[PDB]
Amino acid sequence: KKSYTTPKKNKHKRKKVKLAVLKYYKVDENGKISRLRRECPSDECGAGVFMASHFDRHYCGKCCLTYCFNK
Amino acid sequence: GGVMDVNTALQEVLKTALIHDGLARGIREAAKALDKRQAHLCVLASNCDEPMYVKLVEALCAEHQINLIKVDDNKKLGEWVGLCKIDREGKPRKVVGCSCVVVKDYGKESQAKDVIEEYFKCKK
């Protein structure tokens, strides 16, 4: 019947903004790749997916309900 | 088979590689492809976004699997794989570079792919 009234909140999660991604391997010497944190060897990871070093946390987007330390 | 030119040979790879879905486009998939042993071919190209990644791709070839080939001009590889596959005579919505791609066991192994690539690879 009736049509909607007026709220004012109108936000979005974030658009997963376009950034320069993969510098999780750091260039030091040739041809070495200097990891700062593990490229996770979970129980289904192929070791082609990194794990976030959050600071205060340890979180993978694939292992997101499991394998999440708080350090 | 082939005429044993590096570019039109790598095209014969790419035909069946498209069907095989061996194409690991973008840095995250490129990294994952060469950190995996399922890759068998790599081609790189000129500065797309950084002069850092062109270095990094060589760094990954060093540590994991040397297989590298360099064919410059991002627009080349960008044309070569469209939205999922090369698409249309035209297509002005995209033609953007893939900048480097990695293909898995020359796509399919069925015919000429093995000989054309093997001729180049042990030399390079």
mmCIF file of C-alpha atoms in Angstrom:
data_model
loop_
_atom_site.group_PDB
_atom_site.id
_atom_site.type_symbol
_atom_site.label_atom_id
_atom_site.label_comp_id
_atom_site.label_asym_id
_atom_site.label_seq_id
_atom_site.Cartn_x
_atom_site.Cartn_y
_atom_site.Cartn_z
ATOM 1 C CA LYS A 1 0.000 0.000 0.000
ATOM 2 C CA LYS A 2 1.940 2.947 1.395
ATOM 3 C CA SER A 3 5.364 4.078 0.193
ATOM 4 C CA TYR A 4 8.554 4.373 2.274
ATOM 5 C CA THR A 5 9.483 7.320 4.543
ATOM 6 C CA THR A 6 12.925 8.821 5.300
ATOM 7 C CA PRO A 7 16.041 7.315 6.890
ATOM 8 C CA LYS A 8 19.412 8.899 6.080
ATOM 9 C CA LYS A 9 22.001 6.129 6.540
ATOM 10 C CA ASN A 10 23.337 4.916 3.266
ATOM 11 C CA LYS A 11 26.777 3.353 3.430
ATOM 12 C CA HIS A 12 28.608 0.466 1.825
ATOM 13 C CA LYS A 13 31.143 -1.955 3.242
ATOM 14 C CA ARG A 14 34.056 -0.785 1.088
ATOM 15 C CA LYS A 15 34.630 -1.434 -2.573
ATOM 16 C CA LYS A 16 37.794 -3.524 -2.028
ATOM 17 C CA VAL A 17 39.712 -0.595 -3.382
ATOM 18 C CA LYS A 18 42.240 -0.846 -6.176
ATOM 19 C CA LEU A 19 45.723 -0.932 -4.711
ATOM 20 C CA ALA A 20 49.194 -2.230 -5.403
ATOM 21 C CA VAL A 21 48.808 -5.668 -3.866
ATOM 22 C CA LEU A 22 51.550 -8.224 -3.597
ATOM 23 C CA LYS A 23 54.646 -7.003 -1.791
ATOM 24 C CA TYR A 24 54.405 -9.764 0.746
ATOM 25 C CA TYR A 25 57.687 -10.925 -0.769
ATOM 26 C CA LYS A 26 60.350 -8.298 -0.345
ATOM 27 C CA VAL A 27 63.289 -7.734 -2.663
ATOM 28 C CA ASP A 28 66.662 -7.754 -0.879
ATOM 29 C CA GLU A 29 69.070 -9.957 -2.804
ATOM 30 C CA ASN A 30 68.839 -11.836 -6.062
ATOM 31 C CA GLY A 31 66.771 -14.090 -6.447
ATOM 32 C CA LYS A 32 65.696 -14.410 -2.784
ATOM 33 C CA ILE A 33 62.156 -13.574 -1.671
ATOM 34 C CA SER A 34 62.181 -12.180 1.860
ATOM 35 C CA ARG A 35 59.002 -13.181 3.667
ATOM 36 C CA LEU A 36 57.995 -11.205 6.741
ATOM 37 C CA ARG A 37 55.210 -13.603 7.685
ATOM 38 C CA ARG A 38 54.204 -17.068 6.568
ATOM 39 C CA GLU A 39 52.467 -17.857 3.302
ATOM 40 C CA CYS A 40 50.158 -20.114 5.150
ATOM 41 C CA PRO A 41 50.473 -23.906 4.954
ATOM 42 C CA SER A 42 46.950 -24.594 6.217
ATOM 43 C CA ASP A 43 45.178 -27.922 5.782
ATOM 44 C CA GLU A 44 43.920 -27.050 2.293
ATOM 45 C CA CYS A 45 46.153 -24.135 1.251
ATOM 46 C CA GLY A 46 48.420 -24.851 -1.703
ATOM 47 C CA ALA A 47 50.898 -22.268 -0.364
ATOM 48 C CA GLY A 48 49.851 -19.807 -3.029
ATOM 49 C CA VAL A 49 47.686 -17.792 -0.651
ATOM 50 C CA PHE A 50 49.223 -15.488 1.942
ATOM 51 C CA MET A 51 48.049 -14.883 5.455
ATOM 52 C CA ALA A 52 47.528 -11.387 6.816
ATOM 53 C CA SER A 53 49.848 -10.066 9.479
ATOM 54 C CA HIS A 54 47.191 -7.868 11.079
ATOM 55 C CA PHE A 55 49.113 -6.698 14.120
ATOM 56 C CA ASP A 56 47.240 -7.979 17.174
ATOM 57 C CA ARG A 57 46.048 -10.872 14.996
ATOM 58 C CA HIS A 58 46.770 -13.577 12.457
ATOM 59 C CA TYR A 59 43.990 -14.087 9.970
ATOM 60 C CA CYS A 60 43.547 -15.762 6.592
ATOM 61 C CA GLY A 61 40.503 -15.067 4.439
ATOM 62 C CA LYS A 62 40.392 -18.745 3.460
ATOM 63 C CA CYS A 63 40.919 -20.100 6.982
ATOM 64 C CA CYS A 64 38.671 -17.534 8.569
ATOM 65 C CA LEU A 65 36.870 -19.590 11.218
ATOM 66 C CA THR A 66 39.931 -21.653 12.013
ATOM 67 C CA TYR A 67 43.689 -21.060 12.254
ATOM 68 C CA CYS A 68 43.234 -17.575 13.710
ATOM 69 C CA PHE A 69 45.728 -16.741 16.457
ATOM 70 C CA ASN A 70 45.408 -13.459 18.376
ATOM 71 C CA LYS A 71 49.103 -12.572 18.497
ATOM 72 C CA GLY B 1 55.005 -28.753 -35.646
ATOM 73 C CA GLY B 2 54.869 -24.979 -36.178
ATOM 74 C CA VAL B 3 57.109 -22.770 -38.300
ATOM 75 C CA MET B 4 59.454 -22.448 -35.286
ATOM 76 C CA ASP B 5 58.939 -18.776 -34.605
ATOM 77 C CA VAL B 6 58.613 -18.095 -30.874
ATOM 78 C CA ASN B 7 55.519 -15.894 -31.136
ATOM 79 C CA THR B 8 53.189 -17.905 -33.401
ATOM 80 C CA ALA B 9 54.266 -21.061 -31.518
ATOM 81 C CA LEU B 10 53.235 -19.562 -28.181
ATOM 82 C CA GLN B 11 49.913 -18.762 -29.877
ATOM 83 C CA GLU B 12 49.340 -22.490 -30.606
ATOM 84 C CA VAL B 13 49.895 -23.055 -26.840
ATOM 85 C CA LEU B 14 47.411 -20.307 -25.999
ATOM 86 C CA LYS B 15 44.600 -21.825 -28.141
ATOM 87 C CA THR B 16 44.272 -24.991 -26.095
ATOM 88 C CA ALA B 17 45.478 -23.286 -22.891
ATOM 89 C CA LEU B 18 42.278 -21.183 -23.013
ATOM 90 C CA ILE B 19 40.206 -24.394 -23.017
ATOM 91 C CA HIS B 20 42.451 -25.891 -20.315
ATOM 92 C CA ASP B 21 41.916 -22.752 -18.179
ATOM 93 C CA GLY B 22 45.645 -22.688 -17.463
ATOM 94 C CA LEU B 23 45.845 -18.890 -17.598
ATOM 95 C CA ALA B 24 46.884 -17.370 -14.290
ATOM 96 C CA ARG B 25 46.222 -13.682 -14.862
ATOM 97 C CA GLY B 26 47.080 -11.054 -12.250
ATOM 98 C CA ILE B 27 49.791 -11.052 -9.601
ATOM 99 C CA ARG B 28 47.962 -13.136 -6.957
ATOM 100 C CA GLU B 29 47.260 -15.962 -9.388
ATOM 101 C CA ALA B 30 50.708 -15.593 -11.007
ATOM 102 C CA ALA B 31 52.350 -16.029 -7.600
ATOM 103 C CA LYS B 32 50.131 -18.996 -6.754
ATOM 104 C CA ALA B 33 50.848 -20.568 -10.163
ATOM 105 C CA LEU B 34 54.635 -20.558 -9.766
ATOM 106 C CA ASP B 35 54.541 -21.374 -6.040
ATOM 107 C CA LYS B 36 52.644 -24.382 -7.393
ATOM 108 C CA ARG B 37 54.418 -26.871 -9.630
ATOM 109 C CA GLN B 38 51.437 -27.062 -11.989
ATOM 110 C CA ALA B 39 52.847 -24.202 -14.110
ATOM 111 C CA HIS B 40 55.063 -25.093 -17.058
ATOM 112 C CA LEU B 41 55.401 -21.848 -18.991
ATOM 113 C CA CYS B 42 55.847 -18.187 -18.095
ATOM 114 C CA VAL B 43 55.794 -15.117 -20.310
ATOM 115 C CA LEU B 44 56.434 -11.603 -18.996
ATOM 116 C CA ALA B 45 56.210 -8.127 -20.566
ATOM 117 C CA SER B 46 57.113 -4.414 -20.137
ATOM 118 C CA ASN B 47 56.161 -2.094 -17.199
ATOM 119 C CA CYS B 48 52.378 -2.196 -16.624
ATOM 120 C CA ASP B 49 52.006 -0.717 -13.167
ATOM 121 C CA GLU B 50 55.421 -0.898 -11.535
ATOM 122 C CA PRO B 51 59.004 -1.676 -12.573
ATOM 123 C CA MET B 52 58.971 -3.780 -9.392
ATOM 124 C CA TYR B 53 56.841 -6.696 -10.586
ATOM 125 C CA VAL B 54 59.012 -7.342 -13.699
ATOM 126 C CA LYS B 55 61.872 -7.875 -11.218
ATOM 127 C CA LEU B 56 59.716 -9.908 -8.783
ATOM 128 C CA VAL B 57 58.596 -12.358 -11.534
ATOM 129 C CA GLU B 58 62.269 -13.130 -12.274
ATOM 130 C CA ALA B 59 62.848 -13.522 -8.508
ATOM 131 C CA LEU B 60 60.073 -16.152 -8.389
ATOM 132 C CA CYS B 61 61.437 -17.950 -11.483
ATOM 133 C CA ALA B 62 64.780 -18.160 -9.628
ATOM 134 C CA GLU B 63 63.437 -19.688 -6.409
ATOM 135 C CA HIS B 64 60.817 -22.037 -7.845
ATOM 136 C CA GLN B 65 61.022 -22.844 -11.556
ATOM 137 C CA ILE B 66 63.009 -21.260 -14.370
ATOM 138 C CA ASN B 67 60.889 -21.243 -17.498
ATOM 139 C CA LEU B 68 60.804 -17.537 -18.280
ATOM 140 C CA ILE B 69 60.164 -15.956 -21.695
ATOM 141 C CA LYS B 70 59.904 -12.204 -22.286
ATOM 142 C CA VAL B 71 57.582 -10.771 -24.926
ATOM 143 C CA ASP B 72 57.161 -7.048 -24.383
ATOM 144 C CA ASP B 73 54.139 -4.748 -24.686
ATOM 145 C CA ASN B 74 51.362 -5.289 -22.112
ATOM 146 C CA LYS B 75 48.820 -4.611 -24.867
ATOM 147 C CA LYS B 76 49.928 -7.829 -26.589
ATOM 148 C CA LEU B 77 49.068 -10.136 -23.669
ATOM 149 C CA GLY B 78 45.985 -7.984 -22.921
ATOM 150 C CA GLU B 79 44.635 -8.627 -26.405
ATOM 151 C CA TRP B 80 45.609 -12.309 -26.205
ATOM 152 C CA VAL B 81 43.294 -13.032 -23.280
ATOM 153 C CA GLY B 82 40.087 -11.000 -23.111
ATOM 154 C CA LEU B 83 37.426 -11.251 -20.404
ATOM 155 C CA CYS B 84 38.004 -15.001 -20.014
ATOM 156 C CA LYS B 85 38.969 -15.755 -23.590
ATOM 157 C CA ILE B 86 39.887 -13.528 -26.526
ATOM 158 C CA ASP B 87 36.600 -12.016 -27.506
ATOM 159 C CA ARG B 88 35.386 -10.337 -30.689
ATOM 160 C CA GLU B 89 37.067 -8.846 -33.728
ATOM 161 C CA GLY B 90 36.545 -5.597 -31.815
ATOM 162 C CA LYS B 91 36.036 -5.147 -28.070
ATOM 163 C CA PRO B 92 36.690 -1.574 -26.873
ATOM 164 C CA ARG B 93 35.386 -2.156 -23.302
ATOM 165 C CA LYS B 94 38.707 -3.819 -22.492
ATOM 166 C CA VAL B 95 42.016 -4.540 -24.216
ATOM 167 C CA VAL B 96 43.961 -3.904 -20.957
ATOM 168 C CA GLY B 97 47.197 -5.797 -20.325
ATOM 169 C CA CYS B 98 47.515 -9.057 -18.449
ATOM 170 C CA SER B 99 51.205 -8.082 -18.067
ATOM 171 C CA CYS B 100 52.352 -11.654 -17.456
ATOM 172 C CA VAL B 101 50.575 -14.973 -17.704
ATOM 173 C CA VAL B 102 51.475 -18.498 -16.707
ATOM 174 C CA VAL B 103 50.103 -21.559 -18.495
ATOM 175 C CA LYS B 104 49.896 -25.109 -17.198
ATOM 176 C CA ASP B 105 51.668 -27.890 -19.107
ATOM 177 C CA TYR B 106 51.375 -26.041 -22.429
ATOM 178 C CA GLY B 107 47.577 -26.122 -22.095
ATOM 179 C CA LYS B 108 46.885 -29.497 -23.676
ATOM 180 C CA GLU B 109 49.603 -31.957 -24.693
ATOM 181 C CA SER B 110 47.671 -33.532 -27.543
ATOM 182 C CA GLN B 111 49.603 -32.348 -30.623
ATOM 183 C CA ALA B 112 52.144 -29.736 -31.822
ATOM 184 C CA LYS B 113 52.457 -27.765 -28.528
ATOM 185 C CA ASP B 114 55.079 -30.131 -27.117
ATOM 186 C CA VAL B 115 57.549 -29.917 -30.027
ATOM 187 C CA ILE B 116 57.335 -26.180 -30.787
ATOM 188 C CA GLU B 117 57.922 -25.172 -27.177
ATOM 189 C CA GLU B 118 60.543 -27.861 -26.353
ATOM 190 C CA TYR B 119 62.668 -26.617 -29.259
ATOM 191 C CA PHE B 120 62.931 -23.182 -27.628
ATOM 192 C CA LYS B 121 62.917 -24.120 -23.939
ATOM 193 C CA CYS B 122 66.170 -26.063 -23.491
ATOM 194 C CA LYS B 123 68.014 -23.249 -25.298
ATOM 195 C CA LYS B 124 66.239 -20.501 -23.338
#
